[PDB]
Design a binder for this molecule. Sequence first.
Ligand SMILES: *[C@@H]1O[C@H](CO)[C@@H](O)[C@H](O)[C@H]1NC(C)=O
Ligand SMILES: *[C@@H]1O[C@H](CO)[C@@H](O)[C@H](O)[C@H]1NC(C)=O
Ligand SMILES: *[C@@H]1O[C@H](CO)[C@@H](O)[C@H](O)[C@H]1NC(C)=O
Ligand SMILES: *[C@@H]1O[C@H](CO)[C@@H](O)[C@H](O)[C@H]1NC(C)=O
Ligand SMILES: *[C@@H]1O[C@H](CO)[C@@H](O)[C@H](O)[C@H]1NC(C)=O
Ligand SMILES: *[C@@H]1O[C@H](CO)[C@@H](O)[C@H](O)[C@H]1NC(C)=O
Lengths: 192, 48, 288, 96, 96
Amino acid sequence: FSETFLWRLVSVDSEGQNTITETVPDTITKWQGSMFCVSEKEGFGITKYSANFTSFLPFFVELSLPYSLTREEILVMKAFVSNYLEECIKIIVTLQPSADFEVIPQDVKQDQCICSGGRSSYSWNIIASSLGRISFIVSAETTHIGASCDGPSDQSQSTRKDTVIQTILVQPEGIRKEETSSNLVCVEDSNV
Amino acid sequence: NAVPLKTIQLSFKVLIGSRVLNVKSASVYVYDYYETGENGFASYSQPC
Amino acid sequence: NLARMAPIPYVLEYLNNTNQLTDELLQTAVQFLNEGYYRQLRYKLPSGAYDAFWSSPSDGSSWLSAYTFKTFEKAKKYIYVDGKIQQQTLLYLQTSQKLDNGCFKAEGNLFMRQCGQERDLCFTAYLAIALLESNYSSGMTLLDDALGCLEAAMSSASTLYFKSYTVYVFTLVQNWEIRNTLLNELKSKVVSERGTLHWEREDKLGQEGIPLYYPNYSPAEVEITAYMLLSIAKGSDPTHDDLTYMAQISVWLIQQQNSYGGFRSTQDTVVALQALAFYAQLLFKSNA
Amino acid sequence: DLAPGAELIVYCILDLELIADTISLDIEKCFQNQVSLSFSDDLGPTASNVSLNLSAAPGSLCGVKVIDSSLLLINPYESLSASGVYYSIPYLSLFG
Amino acid sequence: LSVSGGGEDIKDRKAVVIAPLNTICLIQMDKPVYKPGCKVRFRLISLNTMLLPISEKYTAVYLEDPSGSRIAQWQNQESVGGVVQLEFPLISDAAP
Ligand SMILES: *[C@@H]1O[C@H](CO)[C@@H](O)[C@H](O)[C@H]1NC(C)=O
Ligand SMILES: *[C@@H]1O[C@H](CO)[C@@H](O)[C@H](O)[C@H]1NC(C)=O
Ligand SMILES: *[C@@H]1O[C@H](CO)[C@@H](O)[C@H](O)[C@H]1NC(C)=O
Ligand SMILES: *[C@@H]1O[C@H](CO)[C@@H](O)[C@H](O)[C@H]1NC(C)=O
Ligand SMILES: *[C@@H]1O[C@H](CO)[C@@H](O)[C@H](O)[C@H]1NC(C)=O
Ligand SMILES: *[C@@H]1O[C@H](CO)[C@@H](O)[C@H](O)[C@H]1NC(C)=O
């Protein structure tokens, strides 16, 4: 669960039509809202039926990766794409090529006709042929043909874009060794 | 707390997260807290 | 845990004294002070004693309790510290009499593992150091008993580690005879290199190179060297013949500095940083 | 204006006798005030600009709060509930 | 009670107790169950015996760990409108 993203202590003016304007965080949960509302003239009444709010995305893309990797090790990436639309849709997923790390072409390509409450397990072959921090970028085009598969989408959707960054840290095999040599200079208009 | 001359064995289990092939070795580094000079190193390999 | 907390009050005082205190740096330092207080309050036993490894408590630790009492008293200036915590810690120290002859007894057997049979004596010395540095005068029974124990220690206790503690306590208590004679005696046994001076452990038991004694960067020597630097700096009037000694004793200590600040371990990096701060307290260039 | 524990006494005085009967009704908690908390939209994306339209008594200083509901599925005991406030009042129903 | 008049008059005397009143102060501790890495947002409320807001000053409001130590303290906390807003981050250790 996330944090309470609104905590203001606003006051009521005139009859009372106050509008709290806030920004919702990334957590996908419920948003029950309540208050207590004092006034020196009358008192305070806590709300009885709290207000309900929901945040969700029609399209989920998720990557699960280990924290670190060893130099020159073939790792498989698992990209999960989830569809929550009422219509069964198709999806194509692409990986951005880069020179720092090599990506082995798996020669795998299927446009699964995913539907409501469904998820895929697209995978690719990755070699840790680099050093340091490496960024992985996934992409989607969401070519769908909304009405199941045979029925054309027509004017149902235009484009859903979901790209997420991911971080990996590959390190040379072995143990981390360090040697430090601290020096102090006491110079009075002299050069060392 | 301490490691005397007699050998002491420790053991624990580990599950699997993201699968990876051609896994290389790993390191076990043991060292006294107040004296880093008296330290030892050992190798770790996949049982399979 | 008391490695990110012991040196911050000293470095903050040094920066404030040498016209280098900054508002945002002070705020961030207070923030770290609070954070370390938050972790350190976790280890407290209900008896008022402090012991490490809270998941496996073992009848407190008197040395750790004294160190925490030190740190909380010296860090209470900026962040909030519960006074009842300090009061019950001092009460536990009072109840921890255990007077082995004229000497106190240390509780726990995990910290002073290299001083040998002088564990109780070194614990008494460190408790005295804590009481002096805690802005406490010599009017309390604990300090009187500790000074009485340290006074009858000149003949015995032939260890350079405990000599460092006695040097520090006799420097803390303003004296002309005992402190000066002890510093003069210890100054004879100083290892000198090219431009550097320090004190080896003098661990005569097993002086070899093969059976795990070849590591030259022993953390123990840095602590005693920093004690010597601080004690000699805390003099009535360091003469010009002593400034070269300060430079030579500081260059070696600052040589064993890593890329992150921590020199060898938690216990000695604290003393080395505080000694370096006190040494740089006496020297400053306006323009530089 | 009737808190919980509203007790009813109905009595008659005939010619020389007074007879009374009592019960101990419970009333729903209402706090003599009106609040109309509600959002502007029931659904939205994860980075939307949430608008919350609240109305209450005029000239009221009024503190709001929003929380994930999963906590209520763990420990559904909100501090300061519409019964805690009332139960924190001395002598709300006399005894003897 | 005096019923003086042209006809019969009645003089009556009954006994009651007047009792003193205190004021009730409450904690709106949202987020009923906490996890480490969070920020506790207090809310102190001061109320008359009848549910009305009164100005109140606080001097010794503080937390207490399971060990029994005062961790963070506030001094001279005045109620701006009968509501006091307090904030306190919780460390990432946060002994359960
Ligand atoms: C939980 O908190 C947020 C999600 O709102 C995220 O930044 C964090 O990494 C999450 N951690 C875990 C362990 O789920
Ligand atoms: C909001 O959720 C509560 C939870 O019980 C429910 O009682 C209520 O009917 C929902 N809708 C509104 C408008 O409050
Ligand atoms: C430093 O370098 C400058 C050259 O710009 C030279 O003139 C000067 O003598 C050197 N030494 C000092 C102390 O400035
Ligand atoms: C810095 O030193 C001055 C001079 O004594 C003192 O007034 C001030 O309180 C000090 N500041 C801190 C943060 O210790
Ligand atoms: C403690 O510090 C104060 C300065 O605030 C000083 O007056 C006092 O002498 C010191 N020692 C004791 C035992 O209070
Ligand atoms: C507030 O909402 C408006 C319109 O919906 C827009 O500026 C944005 O979504 C929100 N403001 C910010 C700063 O995000």
